[PDB]
Design a protein around this ligand. Structure first.
Ligand code: NMN
Ligand code: NMN
Lengths: 461, 461
């Protein structure tokens, strides 16, 4: 990894575009005004990509040769980097201030800020914008996940009276659905800020390496079948597949995909008759978890619950299946369908304790920077020894307006958050800044554990 | 990276669910029936994650410790992996056949197959499904990027009778909008299969390391301004920013974002009057590229085109701006809005040679496995010494039905593609199988250069 090659190309030519005599470039990151976002992921970026000696004679050479060919010109600021190499032993003269990871802050607030600690490197602050803006992913995943947790708590509570098992209603199935091995780990860890159910193993590695927890692992899983593990027996032997797997994993929870050929036939006949004796004998701590994987998410769940209800003993006002029988909808689930499904179940008078959800692509991939409008902007800049407040303000789009001057975040007397502009924070009217330095001159100054982060992101419930 | 930790959690328990006496598991990947996909990206995966000695005593122990806590049970198939370490020195007893990369194949066709080469490793085939499926991303970006090229080619050919400069009509801006550094490079290289304009430097590295090109680099870029490059000067001194920039880059093409305050009160006044002399004086090889970044993409472009048309000399029957002035729409661009904009310009009688497009999130992030239905499935298995064709066929979703038995791809006598199922491919009816062994027993057996891929992915016309 060469940080000199980890930025938008045009940013290579920027050092020649700022106002002469500029000794400071101050920028900030916000989820421009999901009215509530979870701040998570910076630490990962700090350690893995910005910490220590990121500049070397070799890397400078490599960049030089690349850009020379990339621009068909020699715009690369070779001298600017050698400076950092020769004076700071390849460490970035920058200071990043940010809110504690895990913090739930309303939109339109400053989350973190970046500024060069050396006037000569006034061009460095925005050079690292590209790599820093990717924190949108961890923030969005955690937030979107947390909002799904809210939807689940609301309905689980309404239909059962408690939230027993909430931490496991949304299971991560997004490993194969994301765009890369790295994205898998980042996103899966973001999801674990809110839940404990995951099949995206890469998530456990990242958390262990960059954040850490008291317990051995942040998330857990259970044995489960996949289509190949069923179809391999042959269509005529689907029942044999089911019987084998349930017996193999008899003393623990086990999920078996039942839609290989006909999910309904499977629930009514196979599970409800042919193997019924193997199911009802199951412990409450190790139930069978039937798993549909096709057709309309809400219709299939209701139709599957309706059938199992005629084959098994169904019992606050909502119908509950036997403690040894459960269902998991792990197909076509995203924040929107999730809402439709629980509301759809609530209507049909089905308790939510009867179900769990598996979300992959909709949980870790179908997310974008526009969702929370994660943006990095220049608000302050010193030119000719004079500090002026800068900002954009497109005419045809008042939403894209950025904040002005030096920023700071404060806890308001009423216990809320307020972001102050134009250095007004220096006047601690609402107390001291909430943003703390987490990085400075190649050194990670402040770090948080996954346990802290999890605590900070708890729901009000 | 630990391949023993790079799979979906439930796949760790699959070895105990397969039919007993199973010696082989044969699976395939396809983009279930965008009626034409660009196969690209496997080579990156094979070399970086599957090649060589990927199994070691350490990795076995690590994987064992994690899964013991993850499953709260000891289910990890330690004996299975030790066998691989002792028998093949950590090399994966797997063989992967695949259609040449860059190949443009219609959908519903097998793109690559996987199977174990040693009976005791029948479980390995689907253990690596998770990591192999992520190839959906490169395949999708490249395909989406190629379809957009078709659109640009169609309208640029009707408005100017020549595809000159098509290669640079769609610039990659998605570096910051993507979920990770690795995704950025993977996706960027994918886009570069069809174009040469990019700002996502990560892509140049990956191509150089895993594919290689005749030329020094796959993509190129030109100097461009950023909002902070304009606003740093101050609201009142926007014209100064513009002048300084166009001057700094007076001999090379330059892009200047001009919507920081008022896009229209910038093209008519500043660019059309105040600094017009610095513009009409520019070379055809270093024009001024005006860049709006907000408001309706189509409307802003059309309105900006009329302004510039009434301040500069305008000339197949379609309007054209002086060779020293051009426009790039680098906001709100995706496959769909791209079509609309080129369409809108056509109805307004403007030539496409007048504009270029920059796409970020829409290009590399707003995509999922759903788009092309990229799926990995088991089609052939050998149990009790006999091989049977297997597959899924969900009642409620005919679309999710999978192919049966050993597969092969063939070039029809009409220069088309066809997938022969049930090993019927052994019969040289339509020639020889196009799937080539690319990986076997831990070694990459066949590779392609980026030049071959681009060649294989070319468009008709
Ligand atoms: N434990 C499990 O049953 C499990 C885990 C991971 C992925 N998957 C499968 O892959 C899919 C997830 O990917 P998407 O949600 O992105 O389509 C699911 O629909 C499911 O069929 C299943
Ligand atoms: N050369 C360039 O002008 C350039 C390069 C990379 C990113 N960008 C910015 O980032 C945006 C693209 O990212 P998204 O389309 O994903 O929001 C553009 O609208 C632009 O404002 C601009």
């Amino acid at each position: 990894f060469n940080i000199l090659l980890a930025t938008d190309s045009y940013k290579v030519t920027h050092y020649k575009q700022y106002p002469p005599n500029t000794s400071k470039v101050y920028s900030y990151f916000e989820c421009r005004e999901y009215e509530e976002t979870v701040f998570y992921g910076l630490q990962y970026i700090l350690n893995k990509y910005l910490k220590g000696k990121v500049v070397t004679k070799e890397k400078i050479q490599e960049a030089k040769d690349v850009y020379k060919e990339h621009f068909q010109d020699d715009v690369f600021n070779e001298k600017g980097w050698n400076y950092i190499l020769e004076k700071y032993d390849g460490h970035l003269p920058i200071e990043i201030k940010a809110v504690p990871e895990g913090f739930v802050i309303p939109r339109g607030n400053v989350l973190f800020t970046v500024e060069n600690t050396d006037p000569e490197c006034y061009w460095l602050t925005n050079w690292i914008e590209t790599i820093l803006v990717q924190s949108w992913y961890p923030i969005t995943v955690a937030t979107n996940s947390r909002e799904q947790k809210k939807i689940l708590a609301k309905y689980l509570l309404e239909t059962s009276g408690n939230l027993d098992g909430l931490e496991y209603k949304l299971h991560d199935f997004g490993y194969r659905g994301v765009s890369s091995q790295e994205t898998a780990g980042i996103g899966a860890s973001a999801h674990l800020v809110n839940f404990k159910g995951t099949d995206t193993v890469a998530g456990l590695a990242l958390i262990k390496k960059y954040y850490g927890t008291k317990d051995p692992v942040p998330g857990y899983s259970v044995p489960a079948a996949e289509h190949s593990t069923i179809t391999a027996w042959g269509k005529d032997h689907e029942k044999d597949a089911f019987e084998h797997i349930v017996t193999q994993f008899s003393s623990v929870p086990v999920s078996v995909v039942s839609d290989s050929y006909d999910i309904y036939n499977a629930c009514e006949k196979i599970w409800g008759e042919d193997l019924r004796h193997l199911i009802v004998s199951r412990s409450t701590q190790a139930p069978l978890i039937i798993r549909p994987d096709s057709g309309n998410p809400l219709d299939t769940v209701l139709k599957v619950l309706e059938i199992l209800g005629k084959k098994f003993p169904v019992t606050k006002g909502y119908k509950l299946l036997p403690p040894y029988l459960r269902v998991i909808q792990g197909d076509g689930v995203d924040i929107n369908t999730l809402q439709e499904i629980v509301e759809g179940m609530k209507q049909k008078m089905w308790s939510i304790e009867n179900i769990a959800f598996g979300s992959g692509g909709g949980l870790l991939q179908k997310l974008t920077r526009d969702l929370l409008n994660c943006s990095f902007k220049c608000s302050y800049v010193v030119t000719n020894g004079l500090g002026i407040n800068v900002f954009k303000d497109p005419v045809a789009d008042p939403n894209k307006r950025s904040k002005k001057g030096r920023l700071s975040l404060h806890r308001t007397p009423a216990g809320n958050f307020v972001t102050l502009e134009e250095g007004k924070g220096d006047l601690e009217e609402y107390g001291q800044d909430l943003l703390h330095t987490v990085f400075k001159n190649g050194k990670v100054t402040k770090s948080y554990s996954f346990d802290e982060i999890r605590k900070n992101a708890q729901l009000n419930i």
